[PDB]
């Protein structure tokens, strides 16, 4: 096999050592890569701080209600640690089903933040590009690395290329 590029909807990129989301390209000069430092910085901020929100912040000191070195009456001992086993059951249940809801949301959210960037590029090029269906856009004009940085940079003034593009899109 040789060449070929693909985006999300096909597989994740294994050469992404710096950043969560990013771009790739290929033109008459050569291939390349670069990450989108804005969006990746928002997601990392939200996700990594969820551990501290799970910690209780209404601390109440607890004492001892039974002796570790002397016996306790049988009648009250049973009641003392029938409650304990029934309270440990609520916390154990409340933790499994509460982390799972945080895990579920993180997976869904981070995937939506990616489809928002793909649709941001789509509306930026306008009538000068068509989607091939594998997460990339096929530019219908010849534009160099000064254009690719523009698309990343959000400075792409499409109005100056429309004349040259629509000639190729509709095949004169």
């Amino acid at each position: 096999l040789f060449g070929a590029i693909a985006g999300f909807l096909e597989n994740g990129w294994e050469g992404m050592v710096d950043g969560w989301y990013g771009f790739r390209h290929q033109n008459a000069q050569g291939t390349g890569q670069a990450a989108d430092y804005k969006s990746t910085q928002a997601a990392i901020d939200q996700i990594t701080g969820k551990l501290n929100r799970l910690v209780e912040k209404t601390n109440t000191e607890f004492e001892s209600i039974e002796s570790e070195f002397s016996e306790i009456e049988h009648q009250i001992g049973n009641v003392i640690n029938w409650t304990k086993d029934s309270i440990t059951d609520i916390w154990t249940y409340q933790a499994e089903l509460l982390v799972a809801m945080e895990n579920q949301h993180t997976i869904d959210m981070a995937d939506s933040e990616m489809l928002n960037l793909y649709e941001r590029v789509r509306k930026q090029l306008r009538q000068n590009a068509e989607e091939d269906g594998k997460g990339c856009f096929e530019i219908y004009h010849a534009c160099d690395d000064s254009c690719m940085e523009s698309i990343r940079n959000n400075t792409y003034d499409h109005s100056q290329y429309r004349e040259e593009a629509l000639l190729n899109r509709l095949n004169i």
Partner: antibody, heavy 129, light 108 residues
Framework: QVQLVQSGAEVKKPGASVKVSCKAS????????IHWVRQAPGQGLEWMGW????????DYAQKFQGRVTMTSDTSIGTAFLELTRLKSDDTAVYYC????????????????????????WGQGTLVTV | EIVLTQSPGTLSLSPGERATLSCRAS???????LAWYQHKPGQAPRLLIY???RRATGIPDRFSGSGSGTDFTLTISRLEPEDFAVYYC?????????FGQGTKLEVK
């Protein structure tokens, strides 16, 4: 995990030619350039050239121009260095180092990307002449 | 053809001190075009700094460097027993890419 391996030692008389081979695994061989660095006994590190496995482009230092040759076979994932017209000064240890960025320019002579450098350097082979 | 020269001398120091190495070039180029390697006998080199200002993967914090324009420097905050080796300076400014002479390091 990445790992670059190559052939063993060799001995060749003056006027002959040698072919060192540097095989890679654990990643996609097409991307990333491939360096080639030697070190004659007691001498510093000399830079020979590098190749772009995507299309076979190569670039050599002026000192080796017309003598060195580089090749790549994606089907096997091996990068080759062929050296001709051996002299008594060609005795050294030849390495092979992968780069650390994904880019490329179809002609590494005109590449201008930023922070890059050899990584996953291989082990090196001793060629005696 | 850019040619690089390094601070000469083996620069013998005693363990626990602070060392400093410098790399100078003929003409200026961007600070991103540089890297630092550490070479120990019998082994392939290792990448320490890329771009002259960022540490490689898994590199101990004690290694750091800085510089801009004509002068580039590498600083080892504290010297340990297991880092006495030859250090190299390479530039990615313009083909050919070239290595420096190399600076040795030895205990007192």
């Amino acid at each position: 995990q990445v790992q670059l391996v190559q052939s063993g030692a060799e001995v060749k008389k003056p006027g002959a030619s040698v072919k060192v081979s540097c095989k890679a695994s654990g990643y996609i061989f097409i991307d990333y350039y491939i360096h080639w660095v030697r070190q004659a006994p007691g001498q510093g590190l000399e830079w020979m050239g590098w190749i772009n496995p995507n299309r076979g482009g190569t670039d050599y230092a002026q000192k080796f121009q017309g003598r060195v040759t580089m090749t790549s076979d994606t089907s096997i994932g091996t990068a080759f260095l062929e050296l001709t017209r051996l002299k008594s000064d060609d005795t050294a240890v030849y390495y092979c180092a992968r780069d650390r960025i994904w880019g490329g320019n179809w002609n590494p002579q005109k590449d201008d990307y930023g922070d890059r450098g050899g990584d996953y350097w291989g082990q090196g082979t001793l060629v005696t002449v | 053809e850019i040619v690089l020269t390094q601070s000469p001398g083996t620069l013998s120091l005693s363990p626990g001190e602070r060392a400093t190495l410098s790399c100078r070039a003929s003409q200026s180029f961007s600070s991103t075009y540089l890297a630092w390697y550490q070479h120990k006998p019998g082994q392939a080199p290792r990448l320490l700094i890329y771009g002259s200002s960022r540490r490689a993967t898994g590199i101990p914090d004690r290694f750091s460097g800085s510089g801009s324009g004509t002068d580039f420097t590498l600083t080892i905050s504290r010297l340990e027993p297991e880092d006495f080796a030859v250090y190299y300076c390479q530039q990615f400014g313009s083909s050919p890419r070239t290595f420096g002479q190399g600076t040795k390091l030895e205990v007192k």
